[PDB]
Amino acid sequence: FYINSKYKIDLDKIMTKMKNKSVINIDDVDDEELLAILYTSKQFEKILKNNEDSKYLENKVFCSVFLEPSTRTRCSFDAAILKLGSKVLNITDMNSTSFYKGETVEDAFKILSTYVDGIIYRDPSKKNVDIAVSSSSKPIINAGNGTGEHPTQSLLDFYTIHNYFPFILDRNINKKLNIAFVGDLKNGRTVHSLSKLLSRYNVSFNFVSCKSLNIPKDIVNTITYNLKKNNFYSDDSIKYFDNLEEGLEDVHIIYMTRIQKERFTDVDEYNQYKNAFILSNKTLENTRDDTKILHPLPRVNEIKVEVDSNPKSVYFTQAENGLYVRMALLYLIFSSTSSAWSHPQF
Amino acid sequence: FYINSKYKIDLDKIMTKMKNKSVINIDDVDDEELLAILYTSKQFEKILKNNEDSKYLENKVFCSVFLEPSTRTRCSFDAAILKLGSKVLNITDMNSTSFYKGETVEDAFKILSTYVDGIIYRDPSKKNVDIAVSSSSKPIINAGNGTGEHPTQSLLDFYTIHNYFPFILDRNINKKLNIAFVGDLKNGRTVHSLSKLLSRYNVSFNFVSCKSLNIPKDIVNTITYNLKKNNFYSDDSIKYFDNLEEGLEDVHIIYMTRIQNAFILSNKTLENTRDDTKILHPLPRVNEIKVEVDSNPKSVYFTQAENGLYVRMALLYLIFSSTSSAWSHPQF
Amino acid sequence: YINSKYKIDLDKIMTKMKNKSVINIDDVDDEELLAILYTSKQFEKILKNNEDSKYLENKVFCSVFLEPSTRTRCSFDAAILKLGSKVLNITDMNSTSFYKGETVEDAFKILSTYVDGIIYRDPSKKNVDIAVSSSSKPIINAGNGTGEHPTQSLLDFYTIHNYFPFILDRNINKKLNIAFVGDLKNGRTVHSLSKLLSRYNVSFNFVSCKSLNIPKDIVNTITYNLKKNNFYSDDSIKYFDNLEEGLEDVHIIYMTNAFILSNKTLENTRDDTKILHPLPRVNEIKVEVDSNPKSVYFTQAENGLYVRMALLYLIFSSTSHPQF
Lengths: 346, 332, 324
Ligand SMILES: NOCc1ccccc1
Ligand SMILES: NOCc1ccccc1
Ligand code: NA
What we know:
Pathway (chain C): Pyrimidine metabolism; UMP biosynthesis via de novo pathway; (S)-dihydroorotate from bicarbonate: step 2/3
Radius of gyration of chain A: 20 Å
Largest sheet of chain A: 5 strands, parallel
CATH superfamily of the largest domain in chain A: Aspartate/ornithine carbamoyltransferase
Order of helices and strands of chain A: EEHHEHEHHEHEHEHEHEHEHEH
Oligomer: homotrimer
Strand content of chain A: 5-15%
Family (chain C): Belongs to the aspartate/ornithine carbamoyltransferase superfamily. ATCase family.
CATH class of the largest domain in chain A: Alpha Beta
Number of strands of chain A: 11
Bound molecules: O-benzylhydroxylamine, sodium ion
Distance between the termini of chain A: 11 Å
CATH architecture of the largest domain in chain A: 3-Layer(aba) Sandwich
Pfam families (chain C): OTCace, OTCace_N
Organism (chain C): Plasmodium falciparum (isolate 3D7)
Largest interface: A-C, 25 and 26 residues
EC number (chain C): 2.1.3.2
Helix content of chain A: 25-40%
Shape of chain A: globular
Strand order of the largest sheet of chain A: 9-8-7-10-11
Number of helices of chain A: 12
């Protein structure tokens, strides 16, 4: 098993290590584990695109508990479980208070973990996902919470980037990836998580935003500390812009965020913050030829429909890659054992 | 090898043609495809009634999107997928506005169609099912929308009729089927769709309604056009009544509708019907059919609803199968 | 097929339970109870040893839950899926929004044509029985307003039998004493389990504040069942208003302020006593008790998986049985 032909993956070793691991935070995934996730994700991508048998994890029964609507993420996880050949029981159309009708989170997860092999949990509360992990006799995969931990989104973001720029994994002082993060960097927690993961590599960051909505100082400190630890930190590691023409120059990746109207004082202030960072074929003319455009979605008015036709757009491939990354992570964690012959390989 | 009474079906040829077909409208189903659906539905009926293995389509993962409550239709489709041996993820509980949350229907179906083999979609909006079809990389089956397109309801209605009156398939000038449609023919879109399908055959229509709720003119025009194509149109092809006594006389089929006093069916109103007449109702019923009729052997509305399982299994099998053998098809 | 000493003709008992609806614990007789306990135990050992649990694939069920009861519904879903079968779910509705004008008889006549069996939870008394009349397929009652909840009684009994397997012997010398604590008027889980336990050599302490005592007709049923097997005495049924007296010399404490259980209130219980609670709990049992080896309420909830798998297996199987 090789990825990029450079890095050998002992999937047998790495699975023994990941068996029954809970994944709450992207920091719960180390270098070896990231390689295993990326290799295994790529096998599921090729197997599914070639219409082959995807049933690499068959006899498992999961519970998916989504205590806020997040239909795209929930469907992606359901699809991953079912495509692997396993089964799932769903709790949706509930919130925290109506699901825990008086009962403690500890009691609920202690009991529910006796019924199933694994739990997928989405809850806007941060307190609750951690209480669930303490109480559960079974592995939990966080599908998103209030603190902005959403490891599967970070992992699929990274998988998408590595497919176009596989050199991010090399940690080569000569092969540096430049990414612009555009829009609401205060509230776009998907930026916070992916920045933490990218800062483990030779990466330079453009933060493109307007005053009130800049990247928070704690994320810059984390980026800085991770770049210093691998000797990739310089005066040029982190640049700040308030406009696209400067921000989008000489970047391999443009990652747009959701700009929600609820985040401004009125609709005036919101329509002037869209319009400024709205992406068009015009704003993309003086980007690199190899630039790829990501967006965690849903896209509303941040990227004009005309860009969908532009070969630099990959936000829909990004969403799709979520299926392959969620299948990979479930396979590595919930497999009973491994043997050589049993792993996915196309 | 594949015969429907005495018409031979090249299920292999017909499936090559239906593979990854979307089915939005009963007009998306042609003669050969209708035969394949009827043959295949009948196999699933016999297989399930004899408790044999029904798993003719394993390895598929579907998404079912119901953006209005239609629990009977949703459960029917779920049951069909699961009985075929495939798996499904469900989006229910919701309406158009709460599901799209101001994301476009095109983006939502572009993404969702990357996750699954096929989508079952019910939405009161007519715009939405068509946008979904243009955006989806995967086949869509319309389970009902606002324009009254509901192809699986037409198909199961037709399957039910063909089981009692298999001569409707012959297009023989001497073997004419007479159907009375009773109740709200203006708003009963199930009548509109089935009329379109029935008018492809040697069929005569009684439209039994009050003035305000008659069959609409464009449906009469479509019936007339379809009857003329096969030279089955006459001055006697389409009669209009406002009362059951006259309406229900010499009709092989009585198809009742929800009338949301005059058009209530009872064992009394059934005395001057043919011996062989069968009674359909798309369901749910309120007062249109008195509970006493359930005991009358002419009632088949519950067998009708049951046949929905076998027709939805057939249609999923014919569209989503990725076999390459005649030997692999259902053949009990 | 033995439970250490009773031989089970699982073949004969399944021929009898095939396509049986289970509404009320009285729908389960002695032989059927043995089959459910034997089969439950096989699924317990199979799952704890991570072996293949797929003893019933090829079935498709419908689960209809017309009140929120996420614990019970998930337990049933888990049981169906672990067995290898499939389920279609109708939830997050109530009786009025699900029927929307349509009769219960029409809805179950139709829905029973789609599936091999139905799991039905409805706070209505009348509806589960109408569903049973109308359905062409077996119904398992997952709980209704009349307080019928057979699977809870069965898993309660399974839990007790695991610690005190002598309840099955009907030996005049091997008597089980159970204290029922809290709201015995409204705690219908007490009503059902009392009816089942009274079929055996069992003595009952009813621990309650006056306003919430065990109802007279349940004491009459207990008395009738004890008399039929010649286990009735002046000591068969005691009443207390306090834990000190109630919890003395009882093998089982079943919970549902004076009646808050703590490590303190458990000091002068027998060494072998086990503590049940159908759950969810609020204050009735302090978190400190969870550490006390007498607590089994979480093992109890767990056993619901194995009992619901057993019951579905014995009813829906078309017979190779689970063993070891
Ligand atoms: N209103 O829903 C009634 C129903 C649901 C499912 C199947 C049959 C009937
Ligand atoms: N309050 O939710 C408690 C619960 C426990 C186990 C399974 C589902 C729900
Ligand atoms: Na499901």
